[PDB]
Amino acid sequence: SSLHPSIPCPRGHGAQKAALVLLSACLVTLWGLGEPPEHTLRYLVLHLASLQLGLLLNGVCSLAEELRHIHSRYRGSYWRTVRACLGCPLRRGALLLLSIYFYYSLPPFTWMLALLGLSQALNILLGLKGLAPAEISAVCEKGNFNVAHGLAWSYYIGYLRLILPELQARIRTYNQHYGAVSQRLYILLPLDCGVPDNLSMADPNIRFLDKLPQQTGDRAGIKDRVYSNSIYELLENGQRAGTCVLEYATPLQTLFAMSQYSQAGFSREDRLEQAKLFCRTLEDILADAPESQNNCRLIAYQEPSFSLSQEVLRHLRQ
Amino acid sequence: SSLHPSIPCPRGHGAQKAALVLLSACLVTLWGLGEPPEHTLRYLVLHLASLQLGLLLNGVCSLAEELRHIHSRYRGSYWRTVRACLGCPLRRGALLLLSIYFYYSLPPFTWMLALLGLSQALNILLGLKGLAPAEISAVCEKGNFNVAHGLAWSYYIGYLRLILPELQARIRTYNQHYGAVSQRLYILLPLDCGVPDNLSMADPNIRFLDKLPQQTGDRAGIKDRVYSNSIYELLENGQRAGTCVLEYATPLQTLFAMSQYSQAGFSREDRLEQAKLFCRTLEDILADAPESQNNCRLIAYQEPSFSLSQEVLRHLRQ
Amino acid sequence: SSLHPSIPCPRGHGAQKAALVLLSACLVTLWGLGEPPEHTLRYLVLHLASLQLGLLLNGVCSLAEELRHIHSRYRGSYWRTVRACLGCPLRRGALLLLSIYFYYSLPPFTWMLALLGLSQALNILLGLKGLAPAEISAVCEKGNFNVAHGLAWSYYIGYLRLILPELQARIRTYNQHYGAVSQRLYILLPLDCGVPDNLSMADPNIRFLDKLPQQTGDRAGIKDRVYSNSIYELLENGQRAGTCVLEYATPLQTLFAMSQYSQAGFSREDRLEQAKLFCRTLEDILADAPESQNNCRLIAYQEPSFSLSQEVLRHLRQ
Amino acid sequence: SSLHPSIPCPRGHGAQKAALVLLSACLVTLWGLGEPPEHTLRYLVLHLASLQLGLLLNGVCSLAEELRHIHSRYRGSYWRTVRACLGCPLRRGALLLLSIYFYYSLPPFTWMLALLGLSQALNILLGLKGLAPAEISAVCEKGNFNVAHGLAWSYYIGYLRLILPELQARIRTYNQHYGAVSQRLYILLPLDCGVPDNLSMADPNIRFLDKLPQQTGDRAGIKDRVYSNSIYELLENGQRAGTCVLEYATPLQTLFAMSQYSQAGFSREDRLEQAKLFCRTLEDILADAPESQNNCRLIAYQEPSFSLSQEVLRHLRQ
Numbered sequence A, B, C, D: 001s002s003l004h005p006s007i008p009c010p011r012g013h014g015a016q017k018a019a020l021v022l023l024s025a026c027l028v029t030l031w032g033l034g035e036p037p038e039h040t041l042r043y044l045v046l047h048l049a050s051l052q053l054g055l056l057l058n059g060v061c062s063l064a065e066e067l068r069h070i071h072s073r074y075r076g077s078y079w080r081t082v083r084a085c086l087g088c089p090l091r092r093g094a095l096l097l098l099s100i101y102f103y104y105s106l107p108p109f110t111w112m113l114a115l116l117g118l119s120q121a122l123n124i125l126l127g128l129k130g131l132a133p134a135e136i137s138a139v140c141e142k143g144n145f146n147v148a149h150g151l152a153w154s155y156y157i158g159y160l161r162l163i164l165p166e167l168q169a170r171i172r173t174y175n176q177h178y179g180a181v182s183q184r185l186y187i188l189l190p191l192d193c194g195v196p197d198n199l200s201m202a203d204p205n206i207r208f209l210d211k212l213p214q215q216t217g218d219r220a221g222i223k224d225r226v227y228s229n230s231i232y233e234l235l236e237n238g239q240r241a242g243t244c245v246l247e248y249a250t251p252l253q254t255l256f257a258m259s260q261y262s263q264a265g266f267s268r269e270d271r272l273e274q275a276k277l278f279c280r281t282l283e284d285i286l287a288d289a290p291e292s293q294n295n296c297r298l299i300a301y302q303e304p305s306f307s308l309s310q311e312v313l314r315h316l317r318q
Ligand SMILES: CCCCCCCC/C=C\CCCCCCCC(=O)OC[C@H](COP(=O)(O)O[C@@H]1[C@H](O)[C@H](OP(=O)(O)O)[C@@H](O)[C@H](OP(=O)(O)O)[C@H]1O)OC(=O)CCCCCCC/C=C\CCCCCCCC
Pocket: B011, B012, B013, B014, B017, B018, B020, B021, B024, D093, D094, D096, D097, D100
């Protein structure tokens, strides 16, 4: 993650290592207590059986609702709703049968089932089924259940994938008729999601020079949809120090606008997290993208002091 | 919903009602079993205490990993990492104190703790904590952890919010300078996400007529970014029956492309679900949007024969 | 409430009457059970003592926080913080002393205090101190803890109190030089808080004619602050049917804007409730206001079908 | 805070920490009292059951009144009225079922129910359910049930959001057409709410210099509504030391007037608290407002001698 240190790296296997350490410590503790391994095995199996029964009860409770979306969300099939509510029915049934066998056999069952159902219903009604923020974040990053993922893939598929391949040609054509601009598209990634319309307001050293040859193409029923890129001059000590195609990442603006609107259910901490996730996902996409043949550079910064023109000049000279 | 029957409606309280029924049934069962209610209370409290201890152990395991992201996700505060892993530390600490006071004092604590830690470690190591698809979907829709949410908000914020307010003026200008175009933007929402770049390549009856005057505005460091719309003619039995500003929703293309790129981690079924969610979110946004003063229409359709021209004509003649 | 039937009337004494009925029924039930009145009195006094002790504990818990705002919110006085946390200290102390005396005397106390403290701490930590929506609404309306109250009083104090007294003069001056406008200012109160800028868009029968003589006045450091009122023509059957000074209530727009922004913590149901409360409060203000000498009329409507021009014409002719 | 030390900061978790300390102390006390923990659990559960029954009775009493507003506040749905009076009916019903199962079955239910109903009726009839001032303030600030909140959002939405973006242009125009006015709007926030209409009547050193070009725009059915600002000169020891666009915050006047009108139900202490809350809310709004690109300053002051001119000059020379 060379963009900015504030970008979090993907979660690793620290939880599994801590779980292994905990398992070893618990085995050592059980050994020290002197309790026989048979009692430990029996009670552990009973605990796992109770967990499976709770899973079944919660799955039935969730099925009560999911059967209302059977046609809209599950193609009108009960089997798919069951599979979504409680995982694979075969595995769940096997585990439930084993639980019943090893509970009724190993040193009442209807009372235990009633108690577990009462506890599960209490958790459901009191809203105790909530998941911790870290668990939610891990699940979303694993399954890519993030707005930033879609925003990055739309920025690449919709704009970069169609602009980077035909950027050096435009820059050349511009140079032949004029200008000493670089041969890359520079994208600004403010982690604060500011994204002003005119760069001069962000830093008066950014001075617009002129446009590149517009790129026209049919897009989703829009005839001759136009892509335009502006050439900007970076000044140092009052004179010209650079000239480049510079632009802000548009999706970040959307993120900022999603935090303002209440209907979006989007907060400012969520805004920062999703901005950093967008930057990381975009960096990941461009690395394995044949379109980005070194034709683009990403500049991510966290506004503390500094100068945006200085950032661009440092990324240009170096 | 109104866009299409296949659009799922937001989840309700069916699970809570099922939980209440289950709680009543369990209470009746315990009443009929003739067991001491005080024993029932003791064992329910013990079960909840065991759940709290398991939560603590899993939170420690997750903290072992989150502490590696203390400076990138939590701004260097150990309090924030603990809060993310264990929820509100005050509430969890109080629950742990109660669980210890009651388990260590009601009719060995260390052995139970070791067994619970062993079970939690086994669940973590073997990956048994995975949420069911329905639970993940409910969590994502409650917290809006979905790509479609961001895509819809980007479409409204970046395109519609700037186009619709200044749409009637362009239509009037074109009508004075040129046929009888319907004064509304008709947005096509193919749920299959099969968005061709040319409508005439989808259904021959739809034919490109002309283009509205371009709308230019500054956007995120790009000077005079141009938005263009296209007026099409609807050939009913070979004769122009109506004209409208027609276009597909661009974000759906991304959903189709994300389902084609492996690095996106996006499935076809996930693509369809996110398309339906995008349509629902866009409808909700435009319902409360002051910009949509009857300035746009959403046309959601699913191809089972089917003719897009008939859909557009039906939504026009209305 | 002649404005609109949807405007809720102020809460009455239904709760007190229901409480009296409940008290009578409970006395009848106690009489039927045959239990002696002395036991009832003793246990009722003990229950009230427990309630007082819980109040004291919650007050101490709240004091732990309020002492942090002693200087900012309580003028640096501990007595005021105590008075705010637990009401009048004299009454609270007397009730606590009576509780102690009638608990230790009437057929352990430290154990009971420990149990009550545990319960109060559990309620505080688990967030069980929440108040029901109806109770919150009643408390806010009693104490006028509503945004609509302030908005109505600002609309009256800031605009109407300075405009209505000098409205007939402006209308006269306008008529002498021209126009057959009425002699009152008509204010639109959409309960949906739509409030478009141009009335013609709301209903094309509303046609602006010309302005009234602007009213200038120094206001909070603004020299020659200007108040302008627009004259509008109401058409019926294509011809002129009325002419009046017509305008929307500006605060409603703010309410609508408060529901859009997430930082406002304002929902759409809150928007409707506060719009109706604003209308009721404004109606109450004008009735007892010498400034409103029949110089203004309020038109509140709920957009279902109907015509705003028809509403204004009906309020004019009748 | 930064505007003024007297501005209270938002309430934190001090009450929860105090509750946790109290819970620990009560657990230690019960441990030292040598009482059966099972008895402690039984009696705690009984106390919570009694609280739930009291909640049910009070909810019935409040429902008796709310059913009169079923069509004006709850759209004719008895479910909504019940939900408002009793919270989530499913959760409350489950809690009631548990309370009945445990009170009627643990070591007479009807007599306790009658006693609890009698106590609740006595509390309702005698008005003993009044929340303490600190609790009411915390609830109002958590739910933003305050007039100052609406006043601040109206000030930002109606005036600043439309003035600041188009403020530098007017200042530049005046500078070209006329002295060296500071390029920022300086807003005075007198916490005493003593807002005179003329600054020169407050401190002679502040003297009216000129007016900026008027800014006209359509607003809620009013054509060409004009916003005007005034440039003042700051006479330090009789010589112009600085110039700025200065003005009081108009809403504070309303707060002063509301404290003068009896029908407003607004007190002087409430006025001061709401003024401080208004300043805090305005600061928070402008912190995250993209319009405030260093285009305004908030000057909050309290008169203990004191000179406004010195305050303005100090905030200018900075
Ligand atoms: C001495 C001890 C005494 C004990 C005291 C006992 C009684 C005390 C109190 C209260 C009793 C409540 C009476 C209910 C009357 C409603 C009848 C009706 O008629 O209601 C029925 C209603 C049909 O309506 P509907 O057709 O409109 O369906 C709507 C749909 O549900 C919504 O779904 P969702 O809310 O988003 O999940 C959707 O959203 C909405 O649509 P939209 O959003 O557009 O409005 C509509 O479709 O539901 C049902 O049939 C299902 C209910 C049947 C199962 C019951 C749930 C579990 C509860 C209790 C059973 C266990 C027993 C324990 C009871 C605990 C109490 C202590």
